[PDB]
Design a protein around this ligand. Structure first.
Ligand SMILES: Cc1cc2nc3c(=O)[nH]c(=O)nc-3n(C[C@H](O)[C@H](O)[C@H](O)COP(=O)(O)OP(=O)(O)OC[C@H]3O[C@@H](n4cnc5c(N)ncnc54)[C@H](O)[C@@H]3O)c2cc1C
Lengths: 133, 666
């Protein structure tokens, strides 16, 4: 059998509330102390977070850059070949970043680029440099 | 139940099974084949049915056999044995009936019965009914003892027993047919009225009550499932066990809040650590924007490394603006999750001070029923007799319960104002020494074969002793007396000239302001035809209230009633009476209870008769001389009138078996 519903009586707890004289008021005060100590610690983190909240006021709206609606393309302008080599130097293998920088190349076209021009732009060496930081 | 099976149930017997008692008288039958048992059981059940269907005339053996039909009328010795057994042990022809056969002219054996209580009277009638010489000694100037009824003018109010606790299997059912007891049911709806004098709301009342019953179930769980029955060598009380349960509920309420607020802070701390991530990312975003701005200030045409800067810093920034937006969305969830948590707090308290006072009333009512503070009741055993409770509504005796013992006393040699001082019992017989209560010098001596002691437990408990036993009662009997509990509760009778309460409300409560005074005037009954309100003192309060003037107690009652019914509506009472049962020397308290460290088994010890030592040494084992009855001997029906009645019937059977011989054992 179990206790009535919403009545809690663990073996362990019975022992603990009876064990000594006033173990009742002892255990019940430990929790009154514990509660107020958690209630105060709530106020700290509330007030701490209220300050951190206020710093972010404004969001990042003054720092937002408009949308570049760029159409993908097969051809590689000598321009964007050079943008690539430099992007490789700064980003290494983050083909997404390299694609975003160049603007008009899909992420696969970037991966292909690595392979086609690999020899002509010493792309090995270029990566060794990026890795070296 | 109905039929012959109804009679078995109505006589507290299992219809389909032979009792242990029956096995002793009919060992041939019960060891015998299954068929003969069923025959027996029918013959028995039928015979009871007959008696029950008309308890105002003696059921003879002839009459019984008359109504039997084959195969059951075939064996006439069985039918005679059964009838005799039943008759002997007061299952039939008990109480007040017309003797078909007038009593025998000559009596056999002399028995002295101490006390004209219902137990005493019941035995006396049976013993006399069996043709013995019976004489009862009553210290009081009236029969009934703890059945006491106040009468003045047309006011009639029981200061002693009042309730018939259901008729379903109650011997008093049979007695009510035999004696005009004006039996009115009790409408159990009892509204509570706090210290101020304002009724408790339905919501409150129902909540607290339900909690009270839940707390009780809880104590049972501690007792039976967790074996929480000893603590620091001492037995655990119901009182202790309720505290422990209540504390554990209070403790749980705190444990719950702790866990809820700990869920807040853990999540609040996630938010803290997130806001830091957001404020540092904003700082980088601020700086990076500036760099992109500066690099974009360099007007074209420009070489490709300068073009790469604008592009890379553009990408880098929209990349960081992505992060910050994802973190802004995460912040939104954790911020709303907070409001849910702060909106769904666990219960503030287990019980408030105002609930806890109402709960104390529900405890006071239990202290009232058991007639003792809950600190005294055995956790394991306080309710053991509760499996044998009768069915049906509880009723009051409208015309006063004294009608019953008075009816039983008719035709009995009762010596009133005769206080037993000493009981001597020896192999050869017993002498009982009493005095006249009015002049203590005037001394009486009664010689008899057997003594039946119906002295209240409170009297048996008295130190120094009111009654001396010679020889002294054996260790096993006296220890049982110490161990058992003799409780206390008192009634205050308020007789008015007008009804100012609700005539549809039978009973209503008052809620005391402290735990310490929960019992004090905690309940009022309107149960009588006349305009009388009865007020109850229970629990710890009862014993203390016995040291307070009647006038003061009536004051406190009126005060409370002014509160509930308005200061105008409560006149001065015409007549008032206040019981002080613990004070009363002829019953030192109200009735028994199962004290902590007692069990029902003590009630059985108290019934066990005493057999003296042999007069001449080496002479054979004597007959039992000193017998015991009264409530407090009857394990399964203690603290009741029916219990007393039943104990009386029992001892009469036992004594008659001893001194008149049992022909029916063969
Ligand atoms: C306030 C109150 C309310 C109660 N309400 C109920 C109820 O509602 N329902 C219910 O079923 N039961 C109730 N009871 C219990 C019931 O009254 C008893 O259980 C029953 O009457 C006891 O019968 P008895 O023969 O065992 O003892 P008693 O009735 O006390 O009889 C014992 C007799 O012995 C006499 N006596 C004592 N000392 C001596 C002496 N030294 N010499 C000679 N004689 C002596 C007494 O005066 C008494 O007449 C109530 C009891 C009380 C106090």
């Amino acid at each position: 059998r179990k206790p009535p519903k919403g009545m809690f009586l663990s073996q362990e707890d019975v022992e603990a509330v009876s064990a000594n004289a006033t173990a009742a008021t002892t255990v019940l005060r430990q929790l009154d102390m514990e509660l107020v100590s958690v209630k105060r610690q709530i106020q700290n983190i509330k007030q701490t977070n209220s300050a951190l909240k206020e710093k972010l006021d404004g969001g990042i709206e003054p720092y937002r850059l408009p949308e570049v609606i760029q159409k993908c393309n097969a051809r590689w302008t000598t321009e964007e070949q050079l943008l690539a080599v430099q992007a490789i130097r700064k980003y290494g293998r983050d083909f997404q970043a390299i694609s975003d920088v160049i603007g008009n190349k899909s992420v696969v076209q970037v991966k292909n680029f690595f392979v086609n021009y690999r020899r002509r732009f010493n792309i090995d060496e270029v990566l060794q440099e990026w890795e070296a930081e | 139940p109905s039929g012959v099976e109804g009679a078995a149930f109505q006589s507290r017997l299992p219809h389909d099974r032979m009792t242990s008692q029956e096995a002793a008288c009919f060992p041939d039958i019960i060891s015998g084949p299954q068929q003969t048992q069923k025959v027996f059981l029918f013959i028995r059940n039928r015979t009871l049915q007959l008696w029950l269907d008309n308890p105002k005339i003696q059921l003879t053996f002839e009459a019984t056999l008359q109504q039997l039909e084959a195969p059951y009328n075939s064996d006439t010795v069985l039918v005679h044995r059964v009838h005799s057994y039943l008759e002997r042990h007061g299952l039939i022809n008990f109480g007040i009936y017309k003797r078909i056969k007038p009593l025998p002219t000559k009596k056999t054996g002399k028995v002295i019965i101490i006390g004209s209580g219902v137990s005493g009277l019941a035995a006396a009638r049976q013993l006399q009914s069996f043709g013995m010489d019976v004489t009862l000694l009553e210290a009081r100037d009236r029969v009934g003892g703890r059945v006491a009824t106040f009468r003045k003018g047309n006011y009639v109010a029981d200061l002693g027993a009042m309730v018939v606790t259901g008729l379903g299997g109650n011997p008093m059912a049979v007695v009510s047919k035999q004696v005009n007891m004006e039996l009115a049911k009790i409408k159990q709806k009892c509204p509570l009225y706090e210290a101020n004098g304002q009724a408790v709301p339905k919501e409150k009342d129902e909540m607290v009550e339900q909690e009270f019953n839940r707390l009780l179930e809880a104590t049972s769980y501690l007792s039976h499932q967790l074996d929480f029955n000893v603590l620091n060598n001492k037995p655990v009380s119901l009182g202790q066990a309720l505290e422990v349960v209540i504390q554990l509920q209070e403790k749980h309420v705190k444990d719950e809040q702790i866990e809820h607020w700990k869920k807040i802070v853990k999540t609040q701390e996630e938010l803290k650590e997130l806001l830091n991530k957001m404020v540092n990312l904003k700082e980088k975003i601020k700086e990076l924007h500036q760099q992109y701005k500066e690099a974009s200030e360099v007007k074209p045409p420009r070489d490709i490394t300068a073009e790469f800067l604008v592009k890379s810093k553009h990408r880098d920034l929209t990349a960081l603006c992505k992060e910050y937006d994802e973190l802004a969305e995460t912040q939104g969830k954790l911020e709303e999750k907070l409001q849910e948590l702060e909106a769904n707090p666990p219960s503030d308290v287990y019980l408030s001070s105002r609930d806890r006072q109402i709960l104390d009333w529900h405890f006071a009512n239990l202290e009232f029923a058991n007639a003792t503070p809950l600190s005294t009741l055995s956790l394991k055993h306080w309710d053991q007799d509760g499996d044998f409770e009768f069915t049906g509504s509880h009723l009051t005796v409208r015309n006063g319960y004294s009608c019953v013992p008075v009816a039983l006393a008719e035709g009995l040699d009762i010596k009133l104002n005769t206080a037993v001082r000493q009981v001597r019992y020896t192999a050869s017989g017993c002498e009982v020494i009493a005095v006249n209560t009015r002049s203590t010098s005037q001394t009486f001596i009664y010689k008899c074969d057997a003594v039946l002691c119906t002295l209240p437990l409170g009297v048996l408990k008295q130190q120094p002793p009111a009654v001396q036993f010679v020889p002294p009662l054996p260790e096993w009997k006296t220890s049982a007396v110490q161990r058992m509990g003799f409780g206390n509760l008192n009634k205050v009778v308020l007789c008015f000239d007008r009804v100012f309460w609700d005539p549809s409300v039978n009973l209503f409560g008052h809620v005391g302001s402290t735990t310490a005074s929960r019992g004090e005037l905690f309940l009022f009954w309107n149960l009588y035809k006349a305009p009388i309100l009865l007020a109850l003192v229970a629990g710890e309060a009862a014993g203390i209230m016995e040291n307070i003037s009647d006038d003061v107690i009536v004051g406190r009652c009126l005060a409370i009633l002014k509160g509930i019914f308005g200061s105008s509506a409560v006149p001065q009472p015409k007549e008032t009476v206040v019981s002080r049962w613990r004070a009363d020397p002829w019953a030192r308290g109200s009735y028994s209870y199962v004290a902590a460290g007692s069990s029902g088994n003590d009630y059985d010890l108290m019934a066990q008769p005493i057999t003296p030592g042999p007069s001449i040494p080496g002479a054979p084992q004597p007959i039992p001389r000193l017998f015991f009855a009264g409530e407090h001997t009857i394990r399964n029906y203690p603290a009741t009138v029916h219990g007393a009645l039943l104990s009386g019937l029992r001892e009469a059977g036992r004594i008659a078996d001893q001194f008149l011989g049992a022909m029916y054992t063969l």
